[PDB]
Amino acid sequence: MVNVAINGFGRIGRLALRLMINNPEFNVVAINDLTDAKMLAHLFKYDSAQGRFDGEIEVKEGAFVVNGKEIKVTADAKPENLPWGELNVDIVLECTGFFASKKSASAHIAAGAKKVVISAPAGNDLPTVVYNVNHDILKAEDTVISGASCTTNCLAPMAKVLSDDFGLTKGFMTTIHSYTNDQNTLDAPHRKGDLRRARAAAASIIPNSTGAAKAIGLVIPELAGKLDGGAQRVPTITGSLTELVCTLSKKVTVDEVNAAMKAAATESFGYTEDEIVSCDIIGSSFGSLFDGTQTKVMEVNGEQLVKVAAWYDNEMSYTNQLIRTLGYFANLK
Numbered sequence: 001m002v003n004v005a006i007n008g009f010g011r012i013g014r015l016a017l018r019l020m021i022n023n024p025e026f027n028v029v030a031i032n033d034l035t036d037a038k039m040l041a042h043l044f045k046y047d048s049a050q051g052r053f054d055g056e057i058e059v060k061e062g063a064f065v066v067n068g069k070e071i072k073v074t075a076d077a078k079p080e081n082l083p084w085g086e087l088n089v090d091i092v093l094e095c096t097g098f099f100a101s102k103k104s105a106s107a108h109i110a111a112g113a114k115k116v117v118i119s120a121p122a123g124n125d126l127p128t129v130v131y132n133v134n135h136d137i138l139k140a141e142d143t144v145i146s147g148a149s150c151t152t153n154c155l156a157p158m159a160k161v162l163s164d165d166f167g168l169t170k171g172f173m174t175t176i177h178s179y180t181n182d183q184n185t186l187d188a189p190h191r192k193g194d195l196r197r198a199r200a201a202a203a204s205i206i207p208n209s210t211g212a213a214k215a216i217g218l219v220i221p222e223l224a225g226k227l228d229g230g231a232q233r234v235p236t237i238t239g240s241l242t243e244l245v246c247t248l249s250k251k252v253t254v255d256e257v258n259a260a261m262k263a264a265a266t267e268s269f270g271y272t273e274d275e276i277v278s279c280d281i282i283g284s285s286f287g288s289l290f291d292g293t294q295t296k297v298m299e300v301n302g303e304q305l306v307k308v309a310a311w312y313d314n315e316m317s318y319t320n321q322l323i324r325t326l327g328y329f330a331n332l333k
């Protein structure tokens with residue numbers, strides 16, 4: 001049984017607890033967050049995207065009792081002051097967004113935790129892992145790692161098939177992506193100066209920069225620098241689609257591409273030919289759901305261009321991948 005601490009009870013941290021709370025292989029011992037515990041428990045109980053929490057949560061002084069399990073609730077802004085050694089913390093899920101580097105997140109290790117998984121891209125000086133693409137790179141001596149990004153966890157298994165089976169040479173991604181909380185509700189100044197995230201999120205198609213395709217080489221080294229792309233933020237609350245237009249080293253047909261994806265299906269990478277829409281991915285356990293109905297291959301004067309697409313719940317899909325990686329990493333001996 002792995003002793004887990006959650007730093008940051010935002011959308012990822014709350015869904016992480018939903019996924020772990022009834023899993024006897026995990027012992028969530030602590031949640032650290034600066035927000036009032038009553039507000040946090042209310043946000044855990046009721047969720048506009050994922051629905052109501054199936055069980056029970058009680059608020060105590062300095063703790064929650066969730067489905068009969070007591071979890072300490074702390075509110076310390078500095079990780080090195082957190083009681084991880086005293087709680088025998090095996091691994092921290094770092095979800096605040098404020099420690100997205102190996103150096104900054106290593107403060108959890110100073111506090112007594114043995115390992116850390118950062119729920120975000122966190123640089124290139126640490127292992128960056130998409131479960132069931134490259135978690136075999138992890139070593140027992142590793143300390144702080146990155147679980148990559150939500151979009152990377154959708155893109156990577158599908159790009160890995162295109163690279164392995166067909167020798168992908170280059171490609172552009174478009175993620176048609178649910179809006180996020182760093183977009184404004186109504187038009188207003190934006191904290192980071194982004195003129196597009198300043199706009200009313202639910203009113204428009206809103207272009208936004210991405211990093212997942214450009215950073216793919218940390219997960220799939222043979223694709224380093226071979227992908228680029230961007231996002232279009234649209235008025236859905238969660239649920240997203242990653243499209244990829246690419247060139248390959250081999251000529252292919254639509255059904256050959258789809259067969260290769262289905263052959264690579266795992267608990268992390270699903271395959272469907274159902275004509276689903278984005279709400280149908282909400283709550284999915286897959287990190288990525290390949291949609292064979294969206295595959296296209298075109299050919300002009302003997303050269304092909306290929307288009308493919310996979311669904312992901314940018315919330316729950318990514319968190320499922322984080323928990324797979326967290327469990328695997330903590331049990332590596």
Ligand SMILES: [Mg+2]
Nearest residue numbers: 010011012013
């Ligand atoms: Mg979050």
